[PDB]
């Protein structure tokens, strides 16, 4: 089936014990046995729950993987995946990782003796020196937030596999819709759902997608003994929002797009970063490995005095942290991402926005008369 | 206010945007800012949402503590608290701590380089002669699954102190209604809400609750990071569930007293645990440092036959893990919980293959002592 | 099984398809059929739906009656109720049903040829004087908000019965826990589950019980086409308040005794209403038709200076709208129950409480401190 | 703002207490009052809820009208609005209006003496003709169950207010996205808000819109009185579902046109009733009053044995009563929803009993296609 169609049928409608069309929510927390270890299906909701396996099956079947997990949030479901490792292991990131992933491998996972490196993953050569003998993994993020630096994800995931390590890729920016990491060589897909996949700012959740039984067995034992689990009402909501993916990431794709091009070619803004510019490093990569460029531009701005009057006289953008929604946000990473800043060149001018699915005239005119 | 007043007015009724008597369901991940840094309080759900943040506060009041900390599970509240330590440090724990804890305790984050011992938390002496110089914290949990021995927190609390260590208790059994461990100092208290907090069998979560702000700096920093929080619709079950906390354990307790009491004296039970017996190891420390007995009764039947016939006849007991709920749920550790041990220590800490556990629901008194009855002839 | 028992267990614990011990939240419009009318059990959720179903067996099996529906209110039930009756058809109420009820009665159905006359229902010749050839109900509400005046629910019953009408009891005060009209003769009762049953302030719904298949098929057909359904979440917080019902109801009366007694014994209260004091009007009816007298007290106090600082004082009840929650409310009847009000001797110096299950002992002194 | 942006900005985004960028859900019956009678706007969640006011006022804004009201379901809302008339009031009705709304004006409202005539709403003088001196209001529905025949609004309305007579419109096919009735002159507008408005199978509700302050009070006093109310969660799930609207009717439009287009040129495929075929009655109307022709398509198959075939082998078609939903639905009209009806009038309004009904969704066009191709080959 095609992809929009695979977001509608990816799992069997029709609940078995009523026809129902929806996934039931089991707000539940235990179920009855006939006999001692013989009502076989479901036993205790950390383990698991229904809501949240039709959920866990979903987010397989769209990134083509051998089993789902859903986590309390993005930071918990890449937790548990940095947590498959030990003391004494090393994994290599991409340097500009979202500041949540910077944070738990700089601050917590430090303390329980797992050792990073932060890497140019755009540079293969820098990413192979990096390589100790007791790496375990290489975690890449492609596009980055908020500078939107593509990485090579086949080229990550070769020299990963000749090198006996997996490969880790936050899919967040792009989706399954956009770009799958697992028919590019990736070991694990993992995604903050609270993003474009529930669409609709109102649910916090991570997803992680595995490519084998063994890595099955080894998360599910991570996500039941630390139990960062998604509750059943979330995974109904993330399920309904799964449903409208690709008619959003479209209408998200038109009006980034068009934003991206008059952005680009105005006299108070001096630099856009948007994987569709010709002129954004790797560009042709960024149509190779994905069938869209996003929605998420970054834009440095003249001068203090613009990025201020920009902030109060945008209609339709709203200050907020987060991204992925059916409306506009705007947030200024130098004042609202913390967790090297210059070192990646986040300027205390530069503007992120994630682009809406309002009119993309209706947003290129707030934009046109936001910096007037 | 009296404890049943609390579990009503422990906060604010009325919130300020409508006066709503309850607290409203945000179904939101982030907050509108008036300009960047200028928000009301929040910003983004995983580091506040303003439910979560009526229930972080109630079990913090409940418990008489500085904060509270909602997370998505029992165990993620335990991981988050061992969490608070580092590679090279040692914890103590009650040697028959809950199986979901021994396993991430001996599993997960012995990976870390986290160090546990083992002790029988009821004798203070080997307690005292497991602190190493690397110990950070003793954990107990009082009283244990399923053979309710029990711990004198107030004295485990002192010699803590006395060594620069942290206490943490897991009062899930017992709830806030009928034991406070930071009244008898401990410094960090947990619940697996799924159990008694919540009540009606239908939410999974974990609560954590700690006396100090520097402890309060550091889980946030732990919640936050690594993102194992209670989503806004379980928060909302688990402060309705709250509101019927007092009411519902002075009905259990009724229920369990008498339960205990009958199946003390039947024919067909060797041994009976529960607090409230006379006979049942440390009874005097049980009705100090708790105002009731628990819920929760474990009774060795007397054969094979008998168990079989107990599982098969029950009316009112439902076949099920969890406990805590207003319906009646019946277990056999040697089958469902303690399957993992050997047989080895299992005749250690007594837990035959005869052991049921009961956990006593809301039900008429009458009507489960008459099925106990049925059931066992 | 007692009462406290089928609160638990009236219906099967064990939903079919995975064992769960709740009902699932079936938040769904339709259900798939397997051929053309042939997936039978359910079809689209106005019709009937699981949850909701599961609710409306639940009531039935609490008041011992044939079939029981859920409505999206109290206000919802009653009206489904008289709109079981046509253009020129009579209906006798009780004098001081709440102001909903009389409101519909007299500024609604009124509009649709449904003609009433208001009683006093504690005088039985009264209530056979009332009776026209175009009567086909009685309608009683005992005891009544807000003046708690007790209606002989077995000698109304006796009377319809004889002359060939319909019984209809609003329930909600007593609860099914405390009185069975059904038991008395009752045709119908119905309940604001906005009240005792949900119990938490956080649900509005109301529920039809009847005591015959021809009066199921009758409400079912109004409930379908009219269509003011109970939606599943609101059924389920319903089914989960239910659940501690007994257990509430039993501290609501220890701690509403004890407050009758306190009041009706204090300087500046000079009248009290409350079934449980051997001076209420009808107070051995009381004892014999219900097993409780329930948690709603009025009192008149002494002056507008009074109630105004009472209202002011008071620490543990909220002053607001509705009744029957764990928490103690308040309001002023004379200046919050609009929809006479001096004929039936509502003071503008009376108040009305609702006592929650807060401790008996804080409820007294609160009320002490107010009026000291 | 253009439609696109309305649907996402047609109210304030950042609500006053905490800036969530999303409605919270007032779980909630009553409010606390500072004193008696100043309360921040609610005092009992029947006559007004918040969560329930954002969706009524958000559905008011899509329309161009004065205040909206949600119910418990679409025909709870045509049961409140024909309940502003009174016993002797006369209704004209479009003649092959929905089953369900046959139901409540002729089985229900028929013994509240409210009158009613059926006629051909497409034929201005025979409604002109219909008009007796205690007729009030002309009830539209535009496009119809099953056979989509299309009414002139702006006629209707302009004959209407000629003859002091309310014009209510159904607008449940076409949505607010693609008609706008009280633009055209509608004085109330209503939907089965369960289909398109929620669009994911997953809310029973009904909106009503009214276009002046004394329809506000009436038809408040009513929703109020008679309280058929739509809780807050489902007001949650159709405000997200409205979000969506926009983008799901571009998509359902396209797949639409395209299965239209595929079955009218179809061998087995005798007639197609679609508004955006150029032979279906009244097509220039239809592209003059609204801006998209909709996702409903009707087919009358070649025989009895087609029929079965398709409904025994279409894979991405759910066969179901409803419709407006992301995923694509069929039905059977004769046997599921005009089985009431004789065969005498099936004939007249021409539903045979090949006549087949599916309701297109945003599955990828092409599989819907190959869908029905393999299908009815
Ligand atoms: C005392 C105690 N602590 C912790 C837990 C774990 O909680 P959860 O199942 O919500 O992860 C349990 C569960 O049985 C328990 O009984
Ligand atoms: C046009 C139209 N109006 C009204 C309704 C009735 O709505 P509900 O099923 O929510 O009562 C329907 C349902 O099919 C409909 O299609
Ligand atoms: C927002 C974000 C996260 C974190 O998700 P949470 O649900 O906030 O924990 C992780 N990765 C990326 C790329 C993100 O954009
Ligand atoms: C509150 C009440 C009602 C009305 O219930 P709603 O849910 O508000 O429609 C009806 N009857 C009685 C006795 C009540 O107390």
Redo the contacts between chains.
Sequence with gaps: ?????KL??GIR??????????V??????????????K?Q??????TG??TRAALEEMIAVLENGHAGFA??????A??ATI?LF??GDHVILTDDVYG?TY??IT??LN????EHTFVDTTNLEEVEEAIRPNTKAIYVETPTNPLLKITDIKKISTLAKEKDLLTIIDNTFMTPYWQSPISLGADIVLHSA?KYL?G?????A?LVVVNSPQLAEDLH??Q????????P??S??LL?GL??L???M??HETNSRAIAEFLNNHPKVNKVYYPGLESHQNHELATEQANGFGAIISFDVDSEETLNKV?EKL??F?????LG???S?IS?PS??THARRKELGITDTLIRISV????G??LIEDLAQALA
């Design positions: 089936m095609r992809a929009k169609t509608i049928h409608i029709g609940e078995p014990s009523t026809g129902s069309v929806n039931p929510i089991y707000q539940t927390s235990t179920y009855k046995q006939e006999a001692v270890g009502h299906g479901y036993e205790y909701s950390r729950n229904p986590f309390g949030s993005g930071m918990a890449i937790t947590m030990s003391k949540g944070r738990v601050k917590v303390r329980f003796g797992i609270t529930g609709h700012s109102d649910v916090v991570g034992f991570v039941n003994s630390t139990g960062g689990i998604l509750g009402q979330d109904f909501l309904r449903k409208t690709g008619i959003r479209e209408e902030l209609q339709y709203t200050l907020a942290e987060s929604a059916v409306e946000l200024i004042q609202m809406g699915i309002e009119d005239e209706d």
